Amino acid sequence: TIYHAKDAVQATKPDMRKPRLVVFVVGETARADHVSFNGYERDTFPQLAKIDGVTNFSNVTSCGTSTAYSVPCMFSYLGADEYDVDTAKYQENVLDTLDRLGVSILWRDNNSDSKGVMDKLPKAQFADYKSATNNAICNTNPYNECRDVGMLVGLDDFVAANNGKDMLIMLHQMGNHGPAYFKRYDEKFAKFTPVCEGNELAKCEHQSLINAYDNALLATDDFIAQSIQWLQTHSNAYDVSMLYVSDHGESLGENGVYLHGMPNAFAPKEQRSVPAFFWTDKQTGITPMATDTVLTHDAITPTLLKLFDVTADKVKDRTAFIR
């Protein structure tokens, strides 16, 4: 494995200050321009809007347009202009660094898998939440599809087993994954009707396609809010923060393009303009950058290092989501 941060050091330890507990929601297929906070005409994030201390970032560009390309890039040290999807899984990434420095790393996945990111770490630190063998929240819809909120169940058991350590929990969302947006949310989120079903996206009425997409964002709004609420139940003993970034956006019929994964060279705006949210408890001393900072997926790795008081020369100058 090719290293990049063997110099990384943790400036303060959880035995000499409050331990730190962070949830990083790795979002899926969410577009920046369908976020209420970014000027969308629909209130797609009602529950997040009621939580104080949430920063919305209005100018975030993803590293790529697919899950397989963007997810490794989000945890990489190389940045988007130097990232190589084909050698990514042999590079030291930010989670390798934090685990080495003693931060407890957990990856729960309701999407696919970590696309190589967790591969160097013990397998017990990755959990498949697409199956009812782990996910207790699957029988809430006619499809029996397991839901992102199920990834929150039993996180206290993980906290208990890591009592007093710093902890970083990745929750990899099913989110807005298509083509079957109508399957991605339970009935209580079916606010926008009528809804496109079936996989022939270009054949649906355009408004019905958007309606299904926006309904899935409502379910993601709920999941993120529930994630912050769960963190709040540990705010006494832990410095708690939540970072959300989507892996890429989605085309919804613009110029006849649907889904995503188009090469960066011809990729439409809509596939790379992603939402990002950051929440932290006022106790932590973490300060967000301005909501309108020009940001990319390159900001993720310095953000996670700063959240755990880790410095690494490779990303010393890099802009993060936080100061």
Dig out the tokens for 36 from the structure: 């209420």
Q: How far apart are CA 170 and CA 126, in angstroms?
A: 9
Where are the strands (E) in the chain, listed by range? 9-10, 20-27, 54-56, 60-61, 104-109, 126-128, 167-172, 239-246, 251-252, 258-259, 276-280, 295-296, 310-311
Q: How far apart are CA 64 and CA 78, in angstroms?
A: 14
Q: Which residues are annotated as a binding site for Zn(2+)?
A: 28, 67, 247-248
Question: Hey, which residues does 106 pair with through a beta bridge?
Answer: 169
State phi, psi for 229 to the nearest 5 degrees. -60, -40
10 Å CB burial of residue 179 (0-12, 13-18, 19+) is middle
Of the candidates 90, 93, 216, the residue with the CA atom closest to the CA atom of residue 145: 216
Q: How far apart are CA 121 and CA 203, in angstroms?
A: 44
Q: Which residues are annotated as a binding site?
A: 28, 67, 247-248
CB 223 within 8 A of CB 244: no
- Alpha-carbon distances, residue 75 vs 39, 68, 101, 177 (angstroms): 29, 12, 16, 20
Q: How far apart are CA 109 and CA 101, in angstroms?
A: 23
10 Å CB burial of residue 115 (0-12, 13-18, 19+) is buried
- Alpha-carbon distances, residue 191 vs 33, 43, 104, 140 (angstroms): 19, 10, 39, 17
Technique behind this structure? X-ray
Amino acid letter for position 276: A
From its phi and psi, is residue 140 left (phi > 0), alpha (psi between -120 and 50) or beta? alpha
